Design a protein around this ligand. Structure first.
Ligand SMILES: C[C@H](COc1ccc([C@@H]2Oc3ccc(O)cc3S[C@@H]2c2ccc(O)cc2)cc1)N1CCCC1
Ligand SMILES: C[C@H](COc1ccc([C@@H]2Oc3ccc(O)cc3S[C@@H]2c2ccc(O)cc2)cc1)N1CCCC1
Lengths: 245, 245
C-alpha cells in the first residue's frame, strides 16, 4: 500500500467492506424462546467468514506470509467485530444494531450474566463516535489499522522474514495514517484540527482493545465455541487454493 | 492545560516525574529464598503512592472532581506502571528493569506460573520503544495521555457535571497532542513524519492497554492484594487535607 495514493487506499477500503448480515431466528415466532447468546454467537461466526475476505482486500495484507495473516486475525477478530457493531449502531442512540432485525438496548443485555457490562461499553463507544461525527471513510481506515496493529507486537520470532514482515506492516500503517490526514485536509480541517482528530481517533482504538479483552474474558465462561482452536479454523479459511479462479 | 504553551506542558510534565524506587530485599542474602511476586508486589504498591502525587501535577487533573480522579487512576494504574517499566528497560535489551537492583530476564519470569507471557509482552514493548528511539519528552506525554484517556469512556453518568468533566479531559488530551507535535517539529521531522510518528506512538498505547488487561487477569489468581477495594485506597490517597501546607 506503499505506492497507492491516499485516494486509492480509500476506495480500495470502501470496495472491500463486508455485507451486513441478518440474525437467523424465525420472526414469526416469540422472543422468550430464543437464546440471545446463541443468536449473537451464530451472527459472529457468520461475520468471521466475511472478515477473512475483507482482510485479503486490505492493501498489503496478502503480501504477508499465511502464518502472519493468521496471527493478526487471531489477535484482532473481536476488535474488528466490535468496531463494526459500534459503527452500525451510531445512528441508533441507546441501542446496539447487531443486525437489521436484531436491535437491542441495555436491558436486553441483562438477559445474560455479565453481558450488560460489555453492552454498556459498546454503547458508550457508539455515543463517542456519534459525538465525533465519525465518517465512513475514517471508519474503514480505523478498521484496517486494527487489523494490522493489534498483533504486530506479539510475533514470537525475529527471523529475517519476521523482521521484514514487521517492517512492511509499519509501512502500511504509515500510509493509512497519511490517508486519514488526507481525508481530514480534504474536509478542510486546519493542520491543528487534523492532528487533534487523528489522535482522538487512534485513542478510541485503545478502548476497543479494552472491550475486546473484556469480551474475551466474558466469552471464556459460557458455551460459545472453542472446538478446534481458532488458529486452525482461520488457517483453513485463509489457506485457500486458486482452483475456484 | 488550555492556555499553557507546549513548552510549559513539557516542563510541567518533566517536573512531575516520580522517583525510581528500589526493591526491598537484603542484597547480602541469597535469591532462591525471595518471593519474586512478593518483591514485585511490594515495589508496585510503593510506586502507586508516588503515582498519585504525579497525577496531581499533570496539568488539568486536579481540576476534576475527586470521584473522577479516582476513576481515572483506578482504570489506568497498571498501564501507568507498565509504561514506566518499559521506559526504564529500554536501554537494557532482553531485560526488565523493575528497579536498579532488580533486573530480570525472561527465564527469571518463568519463576511464576503464567508470568513469562506478560514478561514477553513487556520486553517486546521495550524493544519497540528502543527501535523508535522514543524520547523522554515523548514518554511523559504518553504517560499523561494514558492517565486521562483510559477511563474517560466508562464514567457511568452524564450529569451536567459529568459532561463538563469529559469535555475538559478531551481539551487536555488535545493540548498534549499539540505538545507531541511541537516536540516533533522542534526535532525537525517533516509534517509527514510528525503525523506518522504521532500515530506510531498512540498505537503503542493500545498494546499497553492489552498488557494491562492481561496482567489484571493474571494478577487476579494469586495473593497480590484485594483487601479493601482499590477505589477506597485511591480515594484516601487523593482525598487529602491541606493541613500539611
Ligand atoms: C464462538 C465465538 C463467538 O464470538 C462471539 C459471540 C458473541 C458476540 C456478541 O455478538 C456480536 C455479534 C456480532 C458482532 O458484530 C459483535 C458482537 S459483540 C457480542 C459480545 C462480545 C463479547 C461478549 O462478552 C458479549 C457479547 C461476539 C463474538 N466465535 C466467533 C467467531 C470466532 C469464534
Ligand atoms: C496488589 C497490587 C499489585 O500489583 C502488581 C503486582 C506486580 C506487578 C509486577 O511488577 C511490577 C513492578 C513495578 C512496575 O512498575 C511494573 C510491574 S509489572 C509486573 C506484573 C504485572 C502483571 C502481571 O500479571 C505480572 C507481573 C505489577 C503490579 N497492587 C498494586 C498497587 C495497587 C494494587
Amino acid at each position: 500500500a506503499l505506492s497507492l495514493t491516499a485516494d486509492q487506499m480509500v476506495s480500495a477500503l470502501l470496495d472491500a467492506e463486508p455485507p451486513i448480515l441478518y440474525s437467523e431466528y424465525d420472526p414469526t415466532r416469540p422472543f422468550s424462546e430464543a437464546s440471545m447468546m446463541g443468536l449473537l454467537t451464530n451472527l459472529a461466526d457468520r461475520e468471521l467468514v466475511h472478515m477473512i475476505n475483507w482482510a485479503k482486500r486490505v492493501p498489503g495484507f496478502v503480501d504477508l506470509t499465511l502464518h502472519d495473516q493468521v496471527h493478526l486475525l487471531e489477535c484482532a477478530w473481536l476488535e474488528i467485530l466490535m468496531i463494526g457493531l459500534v459503527w452500525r449502531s451510531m445512528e441508533h442512540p441507546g441501542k446496539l444494531l447487531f443486525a437489521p432485525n436484531l436491535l437491542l438496548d441495555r436491558n436486553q443485555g441483562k438477559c445474560v450474566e455479565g453481558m450488560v457490562e460489555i453492552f454498556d461499553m459498546l454503547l458508550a463507544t457508539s455515543s463517542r463516535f456519534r459525538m465525533m461525527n465519525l465518517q465512513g471513510e475514517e471508519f474503514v481506515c480505523l478498521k484496517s489499522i486494527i487489523l494490522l496493529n493489534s498483533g504486530v507486537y506479539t510475533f514470537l520470532s525475529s527471523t529475517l522474514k519476521s523482521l521484514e514482515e514487521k517492517d512492511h506492516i509499519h509501512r502500511v500503517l504509515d500510509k493509512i495514517t497519511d490517508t486519514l490526514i488526507h481525508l481530514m485536509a480534504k474536509a478542510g480541517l486546519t493542520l491543528q484540527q487534523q492532528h487533534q482528530r487523528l489522535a482522538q481517533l487512534l485513542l478510541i482504538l485503545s478502548h476497543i482493545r479494552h472491550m475486546s479483552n473484556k469480551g474475551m474474558e466474558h466469552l471464556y465462561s459460557m458455551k460459545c465455541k472453542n472446538v478446534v482452536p481458532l488458529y486452525d479454523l482461520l488457517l483453513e479459511m485463509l489457506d485457500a487454493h486458486r482452483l475456484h479462479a
